[PDB]
Symmetry: D3
Subunit: 232 residues, 6 copies
Amino acid sequence: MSVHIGAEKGQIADTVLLPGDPLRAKFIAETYLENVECYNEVRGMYGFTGTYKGKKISVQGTGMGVPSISIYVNELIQSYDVQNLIRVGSCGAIRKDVKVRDVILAMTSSTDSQMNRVAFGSVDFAPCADFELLKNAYDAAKDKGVPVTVGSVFTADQFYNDDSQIEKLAKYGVLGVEMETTALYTLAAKHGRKALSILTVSDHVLTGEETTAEERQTTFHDMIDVALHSVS
Amino acid sequence: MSVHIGAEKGQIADTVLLPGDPLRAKFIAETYLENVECYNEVRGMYGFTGTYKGKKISVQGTGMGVPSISIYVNELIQSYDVQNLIRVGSCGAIRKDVKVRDVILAMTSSTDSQMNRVAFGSVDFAPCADFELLKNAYDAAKDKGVPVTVGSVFTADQFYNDDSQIEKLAKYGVLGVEMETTALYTLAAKHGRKALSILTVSDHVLTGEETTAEERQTTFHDMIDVALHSVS
Amino acid sequence: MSVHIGAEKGQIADTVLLPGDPLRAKFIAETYLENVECYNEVRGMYGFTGTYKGKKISVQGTGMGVPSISIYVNELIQSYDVQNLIRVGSCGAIRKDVKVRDVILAMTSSTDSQMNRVAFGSVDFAPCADFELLKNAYDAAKDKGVPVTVGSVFTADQFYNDDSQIEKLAKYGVLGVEMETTALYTLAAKHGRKALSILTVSDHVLTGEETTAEERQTTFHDMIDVALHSVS
Amino acid sequence: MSVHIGAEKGQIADTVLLPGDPLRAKFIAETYLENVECYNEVRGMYGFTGTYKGKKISVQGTGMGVPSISIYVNELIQSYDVQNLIRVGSCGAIRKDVKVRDVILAMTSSTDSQMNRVAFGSVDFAPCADFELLKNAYDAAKDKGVPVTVGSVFTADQFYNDDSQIEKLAKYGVLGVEMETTALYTLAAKHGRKALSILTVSDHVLTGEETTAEERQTTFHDMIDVALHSVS
Amino acid sequence: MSVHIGAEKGQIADTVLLPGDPLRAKFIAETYLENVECYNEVRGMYGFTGTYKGKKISVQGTGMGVPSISIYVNELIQSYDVQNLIRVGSCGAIRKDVKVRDVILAMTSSTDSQMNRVAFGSVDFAPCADFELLKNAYDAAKDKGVPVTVGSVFTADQFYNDDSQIEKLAKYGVLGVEMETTALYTLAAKHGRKALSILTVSDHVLTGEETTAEERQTTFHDMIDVALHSVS
Amino acid sequence: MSVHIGAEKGQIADTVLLPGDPLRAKFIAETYLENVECYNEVRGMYGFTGTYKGKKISVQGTGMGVPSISIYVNELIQSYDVQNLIRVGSCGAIRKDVKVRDVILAMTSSTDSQMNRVAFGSVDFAPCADFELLKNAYDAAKDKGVPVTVGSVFTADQFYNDDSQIEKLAKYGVLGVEMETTALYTLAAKHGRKALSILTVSDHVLTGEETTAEERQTTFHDMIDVALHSVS
Ligand SMILES: Nc1nc(Cl)c2ncn([C@@H]3O[C@H](CO)[C@@H](O)[C@H]3O)c2n1
Ligand SMILES: Nc1nc(Cl)c2ncn([C@@H]3O[C@H](CO)[C@@H](O)[C@H]3O)c2n1
Ligand SMILES: Nc1nc(Cl)c2ncn([C@@H]3O[C@H](CO)[C@@H](O)[C@H]3O)c2n1
Ligand SMILES: Nc1nc(Cl)c2ncn([C@@H]3O[C@H](CO)[C@@H](O)[C@H]3O)c2n1
Ligand SMILES: Nc1nc(Cl)c2ncn([C@@H]3O[C@H](CO)[C@@H](O)[C@H]3O)c2n1
Ligand SMILES: Nc1nc(Cl)c2ncn([C@@H]3O[C@H](CO)[C@@H](O)[C@H]3O)c2n1
Ligand SMILES: [Cl-]
Ligand SMILES: [Cl-]
Ligand SMILES: [Cl-]
Ligand SMILES: [Cl-]
Ligand SMILES: [Cl-]
Ligand SMILES: [Cl-]
């Protein structure tokens, strides 16, 4: 019904989790939700709806980069009237004080995408998490004792950047680099919806060290748990 | 000892409240604090130290605009090793859903100042409140039932702007316009300190309606109360 | 072996066709090539190698937008030493003189992506097709009588753009809008490889008219045919 | 009557001297003028009117930085119909050929403020002194033998600038750095008024040497003398 | 009849060759064309019409830099309805693989001129050669065995550039630097005309070596020959 | 000896007048100077040396636009050690208060050229006339009663500008539009030389009215007279 999502009216829940990898969308749905339906296979960018403790929850792959997620966020909001949009992904830590097991909640994101300069010109637009979701996610992490850090991230257009400024960004307190948050937070606010990015650490970019498969399995699972207690 | 602040080592507290108007600095000190000393009269930009429930607290006028507050924030951090910097001021609401009695906590701020473009060039740097202070301020407002809203603001260089984009900013969910937050949050993060702006409503810019003297007296006083419970 | 592509040394051919949709990668491989192997399933972003008239040819999904294709182009070049990179996709025509059955060969592309401003600053970098591939593709279209048009396209970051300048772009002779070419041509030239985008018409953006399923099936097939005669 | 200035119709003279420090406004009024009245105490940003050789002259503190002076200049022009606006302040010399006792007359100023980029976009707007005032000020300096230099200055947003380009500016002949002139000259020309900045040397920025208290007392006094003979 | 060209209706041919130097315009006309008339002497910027193998052909000096050629291109198009515009000039090679005897055909050009940023703002506009002329010129070079290279060039505003980025441009595959192509290709496309730049090598900029008088005489003559077989 | 000027050491005087049109260079030399020699015919961009009241004076065509004059100014300064550079040209008046017979002295110029953004990035560089020459030229106009106006001009890259902002420029007090001053003043200051542009009115751009041949003959002649009394 919308150009990129093959779902009919009603198949998509009010609350959508937004991994980048459509195979993580599948994984998440199969593993966390009951009564799972796949409402979309267009471009292999899987989307699913199921229930979690009796409440409908969709999970939708976004792809990588601002332009890709923008497509999905726009259609979810405009065509399916989605209300709560929660990115669940990873980022490369760019400070030593950001630990491999920390679950990051982005208040805001910096970017080298031109998307906001296209709309505002000489204004630096700072995108903003919905506080209600942020606080809930934070409270849920605390209540369970999941280590959680709250700050900003950098939304990059180039995974491989020869002109990378992450070193300067780190000195300004920025926590990590990823490629979607700016778009999510900007598009959700523009349409009066609620958005939050929750992120795990894929690696430390300035030391090059990977997080281990085990560490990744655990922070991933913590991230999903926190996500599922962020609405209300 | 520092170019713009006539204080000696030790006169300035770890925690500084940052009104714009140096006469509000005076007012605040005289009204809220015990054992008040004025440590600075340079340029009439008054700064004071006193105690509040047994703890030293300074209050320092910043002046108006990014360049003015930047001067004071930099010297407080670099010369006096100040740790917690809390702007207490007002802003013009730019949305109807922001009410005349709301106390605003800025997660972040947009800007038309070039300060961050000078440092980063093709990066939109999004400044970030320290979450710890934000959360405390929020908790203190809640515990007392002070109405509080948490979102972003716009830091403007021009009070009188013929090319004002506040209308587009409002559609993106931005709450109000003021002239200091971007600088405060950027400079504090750059040096590893903690910053928060707490703001009341001076008026609704897109309707032109002033907030009354009574409304102003009350939200002002609420703002100070919340500020004094934001550290720890 | 490379972060985003699960292939081992040698599985990927010298020449790679680059659809956006990984399901079109599959379709193309199954339909056009003999002895097909799938060398990648990471993120569902399928990549395949097979033969066409005795020569190895890979087909690799890129995803949507500059940041997504940049990832794949960079890894194909740097990790697998790929030599010829040919985008095969569609674009929305933005001029009436660009006909629904035309196969477009992009000499160059305009963009609102910041990727090149990040590297060059005050330079407008104009990306360039490899002429050798362009000419071959052109010759192959001509020899068969496939209608073909040679000009520029616009690489957009935002599919849904409220600040879209396509109308001005059309007056300057630009043929259509898509979301990958700038990245492909910039990254290939930077590493001394050969790149070409060949595009069909998904619709006319300024009239809103879709191209029919039949038209799409035919120009698609023409596009693949032209692609398979572009190397040498 | 105007938001930032507590004066009634008529209290403010046609000609206003514009120090940054409101305590220098006081000093100047008390020391140079007869029959002095203070028409403004709002924010401690003192403004005064008195007479000098029988003619009314006001002196008004501007604060520091483009945003602060812009507020005062705009209200003086729009609310009080002020005609002649003369900045009297200091600047840090950035060339050795600019001597500690030179009184600078700014023909124009460069800037890293975005104020003009906000209004003009891709135009570098060069602000311009009113020549009539400049020439008078120059003639008065010459007639008395006050050493005077006529050139450009740099209006900076950041007193403490990690990305300071003053070294390149100095090679282009720029004389010194301050924080108000661009705003003064731009706002005055926009409304058909006459503006001039007259500046003394606070220090040499690229050698770090302060000007002595004695030197400062003398060039200050010369600056005021020249200012008082610039109208007509 | 047009501000800068003293020609009457009809004196200027459909096809105009565009050297920079008006003395090369003369040279070309006298040497290559029969029945030569000079239709313009305004500013010494000579323009001529003659015939070549029975067809009228004009040759018009453009001067140096985007602003100068823009004047001539605009008047030729708007006042004299010129259809085919072919720059014939030189450029400084910026890569070793571009040989002193190569005749360059510019598909496109990069630039540090602001002309396109003035019109498009946050869009990098990539100007495009008319393919029909390019292909003809290419075919004519091939048929005769004239060595020919097809790629991009850089249109510079500053012959003497202290901030020259040609080194980065060379790594991205850019062939050489000149000062007109961007304007020619942008203005011709904007008005639906056909444009091509054909260029010889004046020198290698990154090695400093001049091309010899003999080399220059030969590539020049090859360039004219190719130009005269580019229409149709 | 320099790439664009065919003169030998010593042929060029300390003081050079800089018309745009090389035929006006000729005219000026033949009409105003004794013992005239032509030292340059390269590109028809004539340059001449003669004497005026016993002092050597050169006159050198610059061509049109920042890139063209930049070439000539750079070579005159670097190769021939020229000290005083005086543009003598015209501009289109953009305000009614600028009269057809006024001789304009540019203190400074705005621009849409990127030349200064290329060197300074986020700085608006304001070019500055040499005051000594300006004052002399002014004094000479006054002593003779030649009407003279002193302010700023706009240096445009595009004579035919669809995105012309001259209307906004006029409201900010800018006097007229031309195409060279920014380059002259920037390049002269960068090398420690003295520069001035003196300009007559070619027309009123916002009313379209031409200045008559008679008016042009007279202001032209006044301009030359003022130029010849600007050194010392
Ligand atoms: N630039 C970047 N860098 C690092 Cl170290 C990342 N770790 C995870 N991501 C996320 O993974 C994808 C890129 O592999 C993007 O969706 C991005 O949001 C990362 N993106
Ligand atoms: N632009 C602007 N607009 C409105 Cl409606 C304001 N209300 C309060 N402020 C604060 O008041 C001062 C300006 O009067 C600035 O410090 C600013 O931060 C405001 N600033
Ligand atoms: N902006 C945009 N617009 C139109 Cl009308 C398109 N038609 C096809 N594409 C391609 O399709 C994807 C978006 O659906 C992108 O990969 C893009 O390159 C288009 N992209
Ligand atoms: N950046 C800067 N630098 C130096 Cl070395 C200065 N000397 C005086 N000022 C003026 O003093 C104030 C800053 O202390 C500003 O009003 C500014 O205009 C200076 N501003
Ligand atoms: N920047 C530049 N550099 C080099 Cl090495 C050149 N060789 C020839 N030209 C052409 O020659 C003139 C400059 O001499 C310009 O028209 C330009 O297009 C060159 N322009
Ligand atoms: N844009 C522009 N406009 C007007 Cl109304 C002009 N009148 C004279 N000139 C000068 O004349 C030449 C353009 O004809 C340029 O050298 C320019 O400096 C003008 N340039
Ligand atoms: Cl992710
Ligand atoms: Cl305030
Ligand atoms: Cl596609
Ligand atoms: Cl000052
Ligand atoms: Cl040339
Ligand atoms: Cl001229």
